């Protein structure tokens, strides 16, 4: 081949999210990614020690377990308040795939990760640290010094021992929301950013020893509340970029049918009484990023790889800003959420799902006029819109939840396409 011709766009990133339980019921393995898709993985979720445990007893959340702090044989350690952990040893490093051999240090969906750079050198992976169930101790840690340096420290010696390319931070949420029993206080606003800070302190004293670049990103929250509760201007400066969470904005938690991830403001939401329905979509949340003084480059889009659902829909407006009954009951694999694969296969204009077209808000959703469910979601169509706004308002790239829901690749055959 010809070396190729450069262009601004041969830099927009791809950052496609890989949830370690893929690797169990749903048979979607690191293997299974591919990798030429993507300029960067992130894996979901390592998590944070406090006392010898890690992990979320609150039952408000999907899962109130708790384990002890283990290393990647799944042997219990004694590491201080404020260490990152192996989320679920056994998935991460434990278990073994194709190519393994006993004579290596480590296996499971981490070694994976690696394999898929052997094979596709440009690719980059980050761990995620934290996510809705595990952001209940960032409060603790990010309160003193010490514990952002056990932190801080404790990033790069996992990036060391992993062979991660960087660190993403995704606490939902400082100050305010996210599950009740998180650890919160007013000072999560100013702690996160030297929290921050000194993340980077560490991780570039450690790449001028490694010889490399170590990046750290976050995942931020969409809301005019997030941008309140948080430096977004001094934590840009900071870290090499910010996942937008520009998805979740309504779903079957509430009675009114509404968009996952609506891209403009549609009045029409606003009638309904559709809760924040002024701000809660994906311009409004960008721009509060821009307007904040977020460079644009530094602000990378997320787009859902799934849907949200509610039962008892009536049938006016095609199901659309209605009051409901509730959540949807079905779901691929948690009521009330569906994955794009399973969407194509099963509902997009199939078994009694009409498709039908928001062009103010650029989403497609589906209505069964027989059973009365309503599905928000977004198809090839509508994350054309989504890269249309990331290239016309100059952002970094794309990030997206999650590789498994994408299994017919569609979705990240549309990004790709298209930056």
């Known amino acids: 081949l010809q070396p190729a011709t450069a262009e601004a766009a041969d830099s927009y990133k791809i950052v496609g999210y890989y949830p370690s339980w893929a690797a169990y019921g749903r048979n979607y393995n690191v293997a299974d990614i591919d990798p030429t898709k993507v300029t960067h993985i992130n894996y979901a979720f390592a998590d944070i020690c406090w006392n010898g445990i890690h992990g979320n007893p609150d039952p408000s959340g999907p899962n109130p377990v708790t384990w002890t702090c283990q290393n990647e044989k799944s042997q219990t350690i004694n590491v201080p308040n404020g260490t990152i952990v192996l989320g679920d040893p056994w998935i991460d490093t434990g278990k073994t795939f194709a190519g393994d051999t006993w004579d290596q240090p480590i296996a499971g969906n981490i070694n994976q990760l690696n394999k898929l750079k052997q094979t596709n050198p440009n690719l980059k992976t980050i761990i995620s640290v934290g996510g809705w169930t595990w952001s209940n101790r960032f409060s603790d840690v990010a309160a003193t010094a010490a514990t952002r340096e056990v932190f801080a420290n404790s990033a790069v010696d996992f990036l060391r021992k992993y062979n991660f390319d960087g660190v993403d931070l995704d606490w939902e949420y400082p100050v305010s929301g996210g599950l009740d029993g998180n650890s919160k206080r007013p000072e999560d606003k100013q702690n996160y950013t030297l929290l921050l800070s000194k993340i980077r302190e560490k991780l570039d004293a450690a790449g001028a020893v490694d010889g490399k670049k170590y990046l750290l990103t976050i995942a931020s929250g969409a809301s005019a509340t997030y941008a309140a509760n948080t430096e977004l201007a001094k934590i840009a400066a900071i870290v090499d970029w910010i996942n937008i969470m520009t998805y979740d904005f309504n779903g079957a938690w509430q009675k009114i049918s509404a968009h996952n991830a609506p891209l403009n403001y549609d009045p029409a939401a606003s ?136 299994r017919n690749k569609t979705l990240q055959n549309k990004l790709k396409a298209d930056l």
């Open 271 to 406: 009638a309904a009484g559709v809760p924040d329905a002024n701000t809660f979509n994906v311009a409004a949340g960008a721009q509060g990023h821009l307007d904040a003084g977020v460079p644009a480059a530094k602000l990378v889009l997320g787009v859902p790889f799934y849907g949200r659902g509610w039962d008892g829909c009536a049938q006016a407006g095609n199901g659309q800003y209605q009051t409901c009954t509730g959540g949807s009951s079905v779901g691929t694999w948690e009521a009330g959420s569906f994955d794009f694969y399973d969407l194509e296969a099963n509902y997009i204009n199939k078994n009694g799902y009409t498709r039908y077209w928001n062009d103010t808000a650029k989403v497609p959703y589906l209505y069964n006029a027989s059973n009365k469910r309503f599905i928000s979601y977004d198809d090839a169509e509508s994350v054309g819109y989504k890269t249309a706004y990331i290239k016309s308002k100059g952002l970094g790239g794309a990030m997206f939840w999650e590789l498994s829901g994408d």
